[PDB]
Amino acid sequence: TRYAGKVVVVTGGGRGIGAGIVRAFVNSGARVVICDKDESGGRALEQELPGAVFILCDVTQEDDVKTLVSETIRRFGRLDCVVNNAGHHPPPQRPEETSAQGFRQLLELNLLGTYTLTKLALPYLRKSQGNVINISSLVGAIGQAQAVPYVATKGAVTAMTKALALDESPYGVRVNCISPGNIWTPLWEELAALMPDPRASIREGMLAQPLGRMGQPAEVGAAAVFLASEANFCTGIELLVTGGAELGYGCKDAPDI
Amino acid sequence: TRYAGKVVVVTGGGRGIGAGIVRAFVNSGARVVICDKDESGGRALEQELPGAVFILCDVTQEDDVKTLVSETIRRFGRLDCVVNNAGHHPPPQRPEETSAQGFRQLLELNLLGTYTLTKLALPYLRKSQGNVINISSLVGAIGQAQAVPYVATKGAVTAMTKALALDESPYGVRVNCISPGNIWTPLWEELAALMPDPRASIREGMLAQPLGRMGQPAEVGAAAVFLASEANFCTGIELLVTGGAELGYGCKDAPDI
Amino acid sequence: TRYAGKVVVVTGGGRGIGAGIVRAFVNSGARVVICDKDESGGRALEQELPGAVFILCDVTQEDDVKTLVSETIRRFGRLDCVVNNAGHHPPPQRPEETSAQGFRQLLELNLLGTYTLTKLALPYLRKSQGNVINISSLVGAIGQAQAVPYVATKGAVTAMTKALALDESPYGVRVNCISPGNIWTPLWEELAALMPDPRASIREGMLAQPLGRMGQPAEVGAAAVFLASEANFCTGIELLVTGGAELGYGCKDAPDI
Amino acid sequence: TRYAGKVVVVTGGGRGIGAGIVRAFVNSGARVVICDKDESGGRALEQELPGAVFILCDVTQEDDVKTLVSETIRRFGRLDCVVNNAGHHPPPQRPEETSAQGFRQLLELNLLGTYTLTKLALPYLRKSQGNVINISSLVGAIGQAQAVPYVATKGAVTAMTKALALDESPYGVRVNCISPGNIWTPLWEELAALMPDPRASIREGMLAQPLGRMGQPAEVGAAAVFLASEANFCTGIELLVTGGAELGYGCKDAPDI
Ligand SMILES: NC(=O)c1ccc[n+]([C@@H]2O[C@H](COP(=O)([O-])OP(=O)(O)OC[C@H]3O[C@@H](n4cnc5c(N)ncnc54)[C@H](O)[C@@H]3O)[C@@H](O)[C@H]2O)c1
Ligand SMILES: NC(=O)c1ccc[n+]([C@@H]2O[C@H](COP(=O)([O-])OP(=O)(O)OC[C@H]3O[C@@H](n4cnc5c(N)ncnc54)[C@H](O)[C@@H]3O)[C@@H](O)[C@H]2O)c1
Ligand SMILES: NC(=O)c1ccc[n+]([C@@H]2O[C@H](COP(=O)([O-])OP(=O)(O)OC[C@H]3O[C@@H](n4cnc5c(N)ncnc54)[C@H](O)[C@@H]3O)[C@@H](O)[C@H]2O)c1
Ligand SMILES: NC(=O)c1ccc[n+]([C@@H]2O[C@H](COP(=O)([O-])OP(=O)(O)OC[C@H]3O[C@@H](n4cnc5c(N)ncnc54)[C@H](O)[C@@H]3O)[C@@H](O)[C@H]2O)c1
Ligand SMILES: O=C(c1ccc(F)c(O)c1)c1cccc(-c2ccc(O)c(O)c2)n1
Ligand SMILES: O=C(c1ccc(F)c(O)c1)c1cccc(-c2ccc(O)c(O)c2)n1
Ligand SMILES: O=C(c1ccc(F)c(O)c1)c1cccc(-c2ccc(O)c(O)c2)n1
Ligand SMILES: O=C(c1ccc(F)c(O)c1)c1cccc(-c2ccc(O)c(O)c2)n1
Ligand SMILES: OC[C@H]1O[C@@H](O)[C@H](O)[C@@H](O)[C@@H]1O
Ligand SMILES: OC[C@H]1O[C@@H](O)[C@H](O)[C@@H](O)[C@@H]1O
Ligand SMILES: OC[C@H]1O[C@@H](O)[C@H](O)[C@@H](O)[C@@H]1O
Ligand SMILES: OC[C@H]1O[C@@H](O)[C@H](O)[C@@H](O)[C@@H]1O
Ligand code: NA
Ligand code: NA
Ligand code: NA
Ligand code: NA
């Protein structure tokens, strides 16, 4: 009942963190529009969850996103929350192995897709005093090795969240982000499979957190439901869901030369 | 039902933010021990709320706190969450008007009282895989005018939260803090009444937030219930409940000389 | 003598902060290559300063930047420091008045131009154990009103600085950023002139800092010389040159509703 | 010549970081008063350095500090910069092994000694438009294992720096802090010697930084000279001298349970 009667759009909701967010909002009583560029996971989720429907939509295609918003309004009559979760982490890449072209393409997905849906949704969010939740990353704040383009995109998302929070505050629309750390998702599994020792990569990922495990999509989903439903004095915050990875010292002649 | 069967201790729970936290936990299904050095508010709250009882306890008195913990265990059989909310903001004081003695006394309340209860509670929190929630302040992070001792105490609380999170992570005990901004409480009203123009002080306090109002104890309480009940991958975080006060530029010859 | 024998490239060095950085490095004993897309300021600076030469270069044009690096090496035989200062702040723009196209173009200048020069310069910086200094902005960290695209670009620069610092640490190349606040430059003057009350805008900009004035290009330049010449244990830092604008509370029914 | 004609007080200047700060200021042309509770190192430094004199002073003793300030003024006629470096890190201690009494004593040194000298020095710093530099720690910001009291003291110092910066800004007195990471000092060597495997502890300390080494007192000293002499638009900043230790992920059933 915590978010009953509300309508939520989750991008990249077909698997991983996005699917966990979809489930959390359905369990809170909301109706959820699952947006994904891939049919497989999202179509099955729509069949599984009564309060959820699937709309095929690539967030990098402006006309897909326009139709996503117009269809949400046509079918459900209101829009209360947009969760900008669609995003990608490329394989580890040394800086000299990156390209400006690949950087631009990653910006299109991780940053501009979030910008585009938010812009198209804002007129409806103003009517409902709704809110925006962007899924950024801990690595936007602290950096990550072999990931210059990805880190840059997430630093942009977190900063953009604060700017938009300032601009939308007079209209009662809150804008927040969640910065997850290592969350066990199909992306994590796919990237690990490309590594020389996948099991050692997964173990290193678990041990990066003081809690000694990776996080779950359900845990990111609970943070999202909190931000939407019970955080009415929170705007422009970065909610860390990281297991403590940012805390303390870790493994990163004369001792000082 | 979100925190049903759990036992929570809230210090300074007789009024203000603490009372809002008490109410939020009772509404989540928890049994709550209200600790306060003053009888008036906490005794009335115990009569009002079925799931809440009042224990007179000054957090600066080690034997009061020992009895608080032993009585909680004797009466309820477990301890799941400690909310260290007791604290005070002195009237605005220029740095040359402060004293080392007054600074020490404020440290006793705002920092050492939180340390003492946490230490005595930790053996029980380990048995229940419980958690600690410290009420710090936004001003520990960004500073505040005419408040050198207070700001220092809250910077200490936020830092201590991270250190304790590291130490207790192997035992499954999470340690987090909430940093509120301007929250409308009896302390805020009392300090405003001492100002030359109380109404102008209250207006300035409301306008420090992009949201254009101060926060409510209930909003801090909802953040506390989230941290206790649904933030299982969060440890060592600082959850801002500030209305956006930290965002953007505000009012703080040649233009550059 | 503090940076004698070293070779520094400063982008956008023809006026404003960039020119202040050029002057600071020349005064430290370095030879400086002034890069700018506009001839006027940079050509005059080359005539004025013995240790400085001007190379016309638009950082958004990959071939301009390739020639900038090859000409620096051809003329001076080494490269020790790249200062990525070229950037632009658009006029204040409400979020619904921005466009994805304008956002992409601002990313090209503020983010990708910094990426491109850094990538082309890194092989030479590795040989000299040199360093990178990116000019970001305080608003990447705290947000700014009516500036969603700009804020996003600077959040990206600050994050990218940390990622690149991690990647280049094994090679002894440090990567840092400076985040200025309000600095009195021709850009500041030009934007103020577009405002309804330019003098009131300039006054508000001065009063956003506890120091009560805006900063000078020379002050950013001194921070840059420090990072290049005397900060050998600093990598991935964000050096704030803001006059305290981020500190404390400022101007951003019932008091809590 | 960068700080010629200026008078600087450095507490705990007899060895370690403090001695490095003393040397850096003497090399900049300043006259330096070395304060230390121990005679051995500081007396030798006074003999070694023409521009430096030694005054025996325990910063926890208010009358020692009063005499430190009055003697500095009597002997040199002005006071331009106070560097609050005196401090201590206890051996690693689990939270249940700490005491409120030991916590209070560490607060007396690490926090209140800095407060007391700053308060007594401020009337003279106002006359000279001087500045305060507090030596905090990276661990105040990110936490540290087995160090609850120490971390709390440094979180307090960093926060207090921001509060005092706000209060002293109208008088032209800047207040900044340096947060070092692992710096190779006699304290580091002494603590390592208490460990089961001292060499392994030292190696782990070096590898906590992406730069792969610990820092030097001279590097902290250069940051201090920058803050005093060339950072006229910096107030309330935390200057990280950490080798990148805060960046990126490090070493801190199902993968997510
Ligand atoms: N997994 C982690 O450890 C982690 C950590 C921090 C942040 N994040 C962020 O969380 C988000 C989700 O990550 P994940 O691990 O669940 O990834 P994932 O690859 O498992 O799932 C991403 C989903 O988004 C969809 N998607 C991708 N591009 C899209 C597009 N153009 N339009 C619409 N949908 C699109 C995919 O089809 C997929 O269903 C991303 O923004 C990622 O950067 C993940
Ligand atoms: N009100 C705000 O704007 C604000 C903002 C940020 C943080 N905070 C923090 O929130 C907490 C509560 O603030 P508030 O505004 O509700 O204050 P308040 O004065 O209205 O309520 C504080 C309560 O704590 C009790 N208390 C005080 N000293 C105690 C002691 N020694 N032992 C036990 N109980 C004690 C008081 O009797 C009172 O019931 C404090 O830690 C404060 O620093 C408040
Ligand atoms: N002025 C401030 O208050 C302020 C505050 C924070 C950050 N900054 C940043 O500092 C930097 C300089 O700002 P400023 O105020 O000195 O601006 P400015 O407009 O006065 O000077 C910018 C210079 O960069 C040049 N430039 C622009 N586009 C270029 C391109 N494509 N290639 C090469 N040169 C190019 C311009 O011709 C000009 O000489 C920018 O990155 C800006 O975002 C400025
Ligand atoms: N060494 C590190 O890795 C490190 C890292 C971060 C911060 N710090 C901080 O740097 C400062 C210096 O650390 P260090 O490693 O050089 O320590 P150190 O023990 O080697 O030197 C400290 C000096 O301060 C003096 N001192 C101690 N108590 C004093 C008192 N009451 N009055 C006057 N002088 C006193 C000591 O006699 C000694 O000369 C401390 O504040 C410490 O917390 C150190
Ligand atoms: O998607 C990943 C991820 C991991 C952590 C994050 F905070 C994040 O935003 C994304 C992920 C998954 C698996 C491996 C990696 C990874 C491992 C080593 C690297 O050098 C790297 O750049 C990425 N990242
Ligand atoms: O208790 C207060 C408070 C306000 C904001 C906080 F973040 C906080 O932790 C505490 C409060 C209430 C009313 C006025 C003030 C206040 C106003 C002006 C001042 O200069 C000051 O130091 C405090 N503080
Ligand atoms: O270039 C400017 C600037 C100002 C501050 C910054 F930190 C920064 O990175 C850039 C600038 C100059 C003059 C006015 C403004 C400005 C004023 C009001 C605004 O709403 C806005 O978005 C920008 N910005
Ligand atoms: O003084 C030390 C120190 C180290 C790093 C810091 F940032 C700092 O402020 C102080 C130091 C020196 C040698 C060992 C340790 C240390 C090692 C393991 C620990 O668990 C611990 O609490 C401290 N700290
Ligand atoms: O593929 C790795 C993990 O991805 C998550 O999104 C799923 O909830 C898990 O069932 C799965 O183990
Ligand atoms: O005293 C100011 C405010 O304090 C809060 O704790 C109460 O919930 C309000 O009823 C009251 O208006
Ligand atoms: O145009 C505003 C300011 O821009 C700065 O870059 C120049 O150094 C100043 O001479 C000028 O007053
Ligand atoms: O004792 C460890 C180190 O402490 C530093 O303060 C000294 O400058 C070094 O000579 C010494 O190796
Ligand atoms: Na369905
Ligand atoms: Na009751
Ligand atoms: Na020249
Ligand atoms: Na001497």
| 3-class SS letters over chain D | CCCCCCEEEEECCCCHHHHHHHHHHHHCCCEEEEEECCHHHHHHHHHHCCCEEEEECCCCCHHHHHHHHHHHHHHHCCCCEEEECCCCCCCCCCHHHCCHHHHHHHHHHHHHHHHHHHHHHHHHHHHHCCEEEEECCHHHHHCCCCCHHHHHHHHHHHHHHHHHHHHHHHHCCEEEEEEECCECCHHHHHHHHCCCCHHHHHHHHHHCCCCCCCECHHHHHHHHHHHHHCCCCCCCCEEEECCCCCCCCCCCCCCCC
Q: For residue C237, which residues of chain D lie inside 8 Å, CB to CB? A: 239-240, 242
Which is nearest to D23 in space by CA: D4, D43, D46, D40? D46
Q: Are A246 and D250 in contact (CB under 8 A)?
A: no
Buried (b) or exposed (e) across B70-96, using 16+ Cβ within 10 A?
eebeeebeebbbbbbbbbebeeebebe
Is the shortest distance between the CB of D42 and ligand 4 below 6 Å?
no
Binding site for NAD(+): what residues of D are annotated? 15, 17, 36-37, 58-59, 85, 150, 154, 183, 185, 187
Chain D CA closest to residue A189: D255
User: From the candidates A3, A115, A124, A150, which is the catalytic residue?
Assistant: A150
Contact A155 C151 (CB under 8 A): no
User: Which of B188, B245, B256 comes nearest C249 by C-beta?
Assistant: B245
**Is B253 marked as binding a ligand?**
no
Q: Which atom of ligand 6 is nearest to the CA of B191?
A: 13
Q: How far apart are CA D206 and CA D96, in angstroms?
A: 28
User: Which of B152, B162, B236 comes nearest D156 by C-beta?
Assistant: B152
How far CA C231 is from CA of A33, B31, C193, D221, in Å, comes to 51, 54, 38, 10
Q: How far apart are CA B240 and CA B176, in angstroms?
A: 11
Query: Determination technique for this PDB entry?
Result: X-ray
Q: How many CB atoms lie within 10 A of CB C28?
A: 22
Q: HSE-up of B197 (CA within 13 Å, CB side)?
A: 6
The pair of structure tokens assigned to B118 is: 């946490």
DSSP string, A119-154: HHHHHHHHHHT-EEEEE--HHHHH--TT-HHHHHHH
Is the shortest distance between the CB of C185 and ligand 11 below 6 Å?
yes
Question: Per DSSP, what are the bridge partners of residue B176?
Answer: B133
Q: Are D156 and B153 in contact (CB under 8 A)?
A: yes
Q: Is C16 left (phi over 0), alpha (psi -120 to 50) or beta?
A: left
Q: Letter for the amino acid at C11?
A: T
- Per DSSP, the three-state class of A51 is coil
Which is nearest to B254 in space by CA: C14, C209, C215, C201? C215
User: Which of C95, C116, C146 comes nearest A100 by C-beta?
Assistant: C116
The pair of structure tokens assigned to B115 is: 């340390």
Q: How far apart are CA C171 and CA D143, in angstroms?
A: 28
**Which subunits count as partners of chain D given 3+ CB pairs below 8 Å?**
A, B, C
Is the shortest distance between the CB of C189 and ligand 11 below 6 Å?
yes
Pairing of strands D52-56, C7-11: unpaired
Backbone angles phi, psi at A53, to 5 degrees: -130, 155
Rounded-to-5 percentages of helix, strand, coil across chain B: 50, 15, 35
The pair of structure tokens assigned to C161 is: 């600085």
Beta strands in B57-106 (DSSP E): 81-84
- Total residue length of chain C: 257
Q: Whose CA is nearest to atom 10 of ligand 11?
A: C185
Q: What contacts B149, CB < 8 A, 6 or more positions away? A: B90, B93, B98, B102, B103, B106, B107
The pair of structure tokens assigned to B88 is: 């005070």
Which is nearest to B152 in space by CA: D158, C42, A137? D158
Q: Are B151 and B182 in contact (CB under 8 A)?
A: no
Sign of CA dihedral D23, D29, D30, D33: positive
Q: For residue A104, which residues of chain C lie inside 8 Å, CB to CB? A: 104, 107, 112
Q: How far apart are CA A83 and CA A131, in angstroms?
A: 9
Q: Are B128 and B78 in contact (CB under 8 A)?
A: yes
User: From the candidates C115, C150, C171, C249, which is the catalytic residue?
Assistant: C150
Binding site: what residues of A are annotated? 15, 17, 36-37, 58-59, 85, 150, 154, 183, 185, 187
| CB under 8 A, 24+ apart: contacts of B91-96 | B91/B191, B91/B194, B92/B145, B92/B146, B92/B147, B92/B191, B93/B146, B93/B147, B93/B148, B93/B149, B94/B146, B94/D167, B95/B148, B95/D119, B95/D122, B95/D164, B95/D167, B95/D168, B96/D119, B96/D122
Chain D CA closest to residue B115: D100
Q: For residue C169, which residues of chain D lie inside 8 Å, CB to CB? A: 210-212, 244
Q: How far apart are CA D224 and CA D24, in angstroms?
A: 8
Q: How far apart are CA A249 and CA A242, in angstroms?
A: 15
Q: Is D97 left (phi over 0), alpha (psi -120 to 50) or beta?
A: alpha
Contact A159 C164 (CB under 8 A): no
Q: How far apart are CA A203 and CA A197, in angstroms?
A: 10
Question: Per DSSP, what are the bridge partners of residue B7?
Answer: B31
Sign of CA dihedral C49, C53, C58, C62: negative
Q: Are D222 and C214 in contact (CB under 8 A)?
A: no
Q: How far apart are CA B154 and CA B139, in angstroms?
A: 7
Q: How far apart are CA A188 and CA A211, in angstroms?
A: 18
Q: Are D201 and D252 in contact (CB under 8 A)?
A: no
The pair of structure tokens assigned to B107 is: 């440290």
Q: Is D171 among the catalytic positions?
A: no
Is the shortest distance between the CB of A17 and ligand 1 below 6 Å?
yes
The pair of structure tokens assigned to C229 is: 């010449």
The pair of structure tokens assigned to B117 is: 């209860």
Sign of CA dihedral D26, D32, D38, D43: positive
Q: How far is the CA of D49 from the centre of ligand 16 (A)?
A: 4
Domain regions of chain C by residue span: 1-257
Q: For residue D129, which residues of chain C lie inside 8 Å, CB to CB? A: none
